[PDB]
Design an enzyme around this catalytic site. Structure first.
Site, PDB file in Angstrom:
ATOM      1  CE  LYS A 223      59.889  35.194 -43.141  1.00 39.07           C
ATOM      2  NZ  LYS A 223      58.519  35.600 -43.471  1.00 39.07           N
TER       3      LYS A 223
ATOM      4  CE1 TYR B  17      64.662  25.792 -40.810  1.00 41.24           C
ATOM      5  CE2 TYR B  17      65.521  23.558 -40.961  1.00 41.24           C
ATOM      6  CZ  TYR B  17      64.490  24.429 -40.664  1.00 41.24           C
ATOM      7  OH  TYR B  17      63.281  23.934 -40.210  1.00 41.24           O
TER       8      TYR B  17
ATOM      9  CG  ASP C 156      55.683  34.349 -45.003  1.00 42.70           C
ATOM     10  OD1 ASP C 156      55.383  34.666 -43.840  1.00 42.70           O
ATOM     11  OD2 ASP C 156      56.863  34.195 -45.380  1.00 42.70           O
TER      12      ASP C 156
ATOM     13  CG  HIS D 147      55.853  39.171 -41.928  1.00 42.27           C
ATOM     14  ND1 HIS D 147      56.258  38.917 -40.629  1.00 42.27           N
ATOM     15  CD2 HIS D 147      55.755  37.966 -42.533  1.00 42.27           C
ATOM     16  CE1 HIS D 147      56.393  37.619 -40.464  1.00 42.27           C
ATOM     17  NE2 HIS D 147      56.086  37.016 -41.601  1.00 42.27           N
TER      18      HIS D 147
ATOM     19  NE  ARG E 181      59.983  26.606 -40.852  1.00 39.92           N
ATOM     20  CZ  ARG E 181      59.706  27.898 -40.716  1.00 39.92           C
ATOM     21  NH1 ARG E 181      59.021  28.536 -41.655  1.00 39.92           N
ATOM     22  NH2 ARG E 181      60.117  28.544 -39.634  1.00 39.92           N
TER      23      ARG E 181
ATOM     24  NE  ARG F 133      63.304  33.781 -39.875  1.00 39.02           N
ATOM     25  CZ  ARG F 133      63.025  34.470 -38.768  1.00 39.02           C
ATOM     26  NH1 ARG F 133      63.867  35.389 -38.311  1.00 39.02           N
ATOM     27  NH2 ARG F 133      61.890  34.244 -38.119  1.00 39.02           N
TER      28      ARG F 133
ATOM     29  CB  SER G 193      55.794  33.357 -34.590  1.00 31.98           C
ATOM     30  OG  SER G 193      56.688  33.541 -35.677  1.00 31.98           O
TER      31      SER G 193
ATOM     32  CB  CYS H 260      49.151  35.331 -33.967  1.00 34.53           C
ATOM     33  SG  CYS H 260      50.127  36.214 -32.727  1.00 34.53           S
TER      34      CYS H 260
HETATM   35  O1  LIG Z   1      59.451  33.013 -38.923  1.00 33.27           O
HETATM   36  C1  LIG Z   1      58.792  33.205 -39.897  1.00 33.27           C
HETATM   37  O2  LIG Z   1      57.999  34.357 -39.980  1.00 33.27           O
HETATM   38  C2  LIG Z   1      58.667  32.142 -40.997  1.00 33.27           C
HETATM   39  O3  LIG Z   1      59.202  31.088 -40.901  1.00 33.27           O
HETATM   40  O4  LIG Z   1      57.906  32.420 -42.136  1.00 33.27           O
HETATM   41 MN   LIG Z   2      56.704  34.710 -41.957  1.00 40.54          MN
END
Ligand SMILES: O=C([O-])C(=O)[O-]
Ligand SMILES: [Mn+2]
Length: 600
Positions: A231, A222, A298, A251, A391, A83, A273, A275
């Protein structure tokens, strides 16, 4: 050579039931000039047909079906591996409505730039028209979308990540509303030109128009840049819808916890992220009689039900998880979900027997092909075998601990909302809010470690569709107007507090279930804790540590609330509240003042 929409192949046989959709597709095709247009149905025969073409293009290779049935590996252009936040925009009519956590540009200006880019951009390519539904199809107000894309890779991954195709299209009826999502890799082709495996551009925009609920993406193939349900829709556009319609797009993972009395509890938990969010989503409790199931790892959409409680649904249909770090010892349920196949992997390494590997995974393979297609050798090659952001894209229905309620359009009632981050110091293992408004403050000021403390409010920092201050007010509004007795209790968790010598004070992982047991007990009013300046925090004796080999002093230290440390935290919070700007709600400032007063 330019063709009118009507004479573009595929448009003569387009579905005509929904005229609004049809006119939009014709308008876009006229602009982008694809070779042909295809409306996707999400069927199995289509999926295999598109995959055959992806293998033919070199975009995919077929992984050993004895190890992963119906599974594929894609390697991306090295310029297109994540991203891109600096190229992501919220284009509200006014800049204030994007706010300080967002990149704004005047929507007139943005449309002029992007319409120019889209002109002719699909030459030499099939334009796919991809209908999809976010959340179970049986919903009261099903959130529908159509993604137009010139990326076959995108189509296939959307089939996994959303309920794609025929059902969604029929749900649109003749004039139903849907989110218009437009995407191009920005790599037009001349007749007879040989393509590359992963087309993309140096020029990228991921743009959102909140008023009209539209998404325009250009240049990247991507993940979150291109799979527009993920997202762009489920968080950014949906947060704006939720703002206007009185619900919450968040989220959050969704966890189902079952106690020894066989009662189920549902929690929605937000983490940034790094965590261990996914490990928690698929928790294996370590105390007898406690079980856990997942509804998502997610995104969560929460809406008040008729009984006045908050119900959560996962708008997504698949997992799109970071591969490196996933392994058997720490997340066997993720590995088992992946083991069932039907998976598209992107930028992971290839084993000699047609299996996949990434850093962290067991096996110590001696030789691999890396994410760039080069030879990699164990304890020798100095570059990562898998890209650090690589991924897996896998159906949720394959998860062995998937909760049966996962596809229920009514969702599940949430008993608790958890916020978390990584903090070496200051923040205790677990804290309960004093009430809803305090809860909002705790979420709004969520801090997590950076290279020093980053604020990531409700873990939505790069995903808000509107002004962060108005977002806080929205949370305040829903709580204010609800039956207080039915609202989820709010907790903050820090699994990662460290001693001065660098030891982890809490062993974490599965043992996190012991903290969740306390949370359940608090919800049932069966547990105590200390009243501290920052909320209710248990003492060691309030936790079930039976069977756990841990120093009690370490747990005590994990739970300590030190006033001096918290006085040091105050000006960090203050500067964040100032950054939130003119739209910072008085209710949030109120909670800052009350905290400062309680600390003395
Ligand atoms: O970055 C993020 O939160 C993802 O890839 O789900
Ligand atoms: Mn996420």
């Amino acid at each position: 050579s330019h063709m009118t929409s009507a004479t573009i192949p595929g448009l003569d046989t387009a579905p005509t039931n929904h005229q609004g959709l049809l006119s939009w597709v014709e308008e876009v095709a006229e602009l982008t000039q694809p070779d042909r247009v295809v409306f996707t149905d999400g069927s199995e025969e289509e999926f295999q047909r598109l995959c055959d073409q992806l293998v033919e293009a070199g975009t995919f290779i077929r992984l050993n079906p004895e190890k992963h049935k119906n599974s594929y590996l894609a390697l991306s252009d090295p310029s297109d591996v994540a991203r891109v936040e600096s190229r992501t925009y919220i284009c509200s009519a006014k800049e204030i409505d994007a706010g300080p956590t967002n990149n704004w540009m005047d929507p007139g200006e943005m449309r002029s730039i992007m319409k120019d880019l889209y002109r002719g951009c699909m030459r030499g390519r099939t334009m796919y028209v991809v209908p999809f539904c976010m959340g179970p199809l049986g919903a009261e107000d099903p959130k529908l979308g159509v993604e137009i894309t010139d990326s076959e890779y995108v189509v296939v991954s959307m089939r996994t990540m959303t309920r794609m195709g025929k059902a969604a299209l029929e749900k649109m009826g003749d004039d139903g509303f849907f989110v218009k999502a437009l995407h191009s890799v920005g790599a037009p082709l001349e007749p007879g030109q040989k393509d590359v495996a992963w087309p993309c551009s140096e020029t990228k925009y991921i743009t959102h128009f909140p008023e009209t609920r539209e998404i325009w993406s250009y240049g990247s193939g991507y993940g979150g840049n291109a799979l527009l349900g993920k997202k762009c829709y489920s968080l950014r556009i949906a947060s704006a819808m939720a703002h206007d319609e009185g619900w919450l797009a968040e989220h959050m993972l969704i966890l189902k916890l079952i106690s020894p009395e066989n009662k189920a509890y549902y929690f929605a938990a937000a983490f940034p992220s790094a965590c261990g969010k996914t490990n928690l989503a698929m928790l294996q409790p370590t105390i007898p009689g406690w079980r856990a199931e997942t509804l998502g790892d997610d995104i969560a959409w929460m809406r008040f039900g008729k009984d006045g409680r908050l119900y959560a649904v996962n708008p997504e249909f698949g997992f799109f998880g970071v591969a490196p770090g996933t392994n058997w010892k720490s997340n066997p349920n993720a590995m088992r979900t992946i083991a069932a196949g039907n998976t598209v992997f992107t930028n992971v390494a290839l084993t000699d027997d047609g299996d996949v590997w990434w850093e962290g995974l067991e096996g110590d393979p001696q030789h691999l092909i890396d994410w760039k297609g080069n030879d990699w050798y164990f304890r020798e090659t100095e570059t990562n075998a898998a890209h650090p952001n690589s991924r897996y894209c896998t159906p949720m229905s394959q998860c062995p601990i998937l909760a049966p309620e996962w596809d229920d359009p009514q969702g599940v009632p949430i008993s608790g909302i958890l916020f978390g981050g990584r903090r070496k110091t200051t923040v205790p293992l677990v804290t309960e809010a004093r009430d809803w408004q305090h809860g909002v403050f705790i979420g709004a000021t969520l801090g997590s470690e950076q290279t020093n403390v980053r604020r990531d409010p409700m873990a939505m920092l790069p995903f808000l569709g509107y002004n962060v201050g108005d977002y806080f007010q929205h949370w305040i509004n829903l709580g204010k107007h609800a039956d207080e007795s039915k609202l989820p209790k709010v907790f903050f968790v820090n699994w990662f507090r460290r001693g001065d010598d660098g030891r982890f004070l809490w062993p974490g992982f599965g043992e996190n279930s012991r903290v969740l047991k306390w949370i359940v007990d608090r919800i049932e009013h069966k547990a105590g804790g200390a009243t501290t300046p920052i909320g209710t925090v248990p003492a060691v004796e309030d936790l079930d540590l039976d069977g756990l080999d841990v120093d009690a002093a370490d747990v005590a230290a994990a739970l300590a609330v030190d006033a001096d440390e918290w006085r040091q935290e105050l000006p960090l919070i203050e500067e964040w509240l100032q950054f939130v700007g003119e739209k910072l709600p008085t209710g949030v400032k109120d909670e800052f003042d009350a905290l400062k007063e309680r600390l003395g």
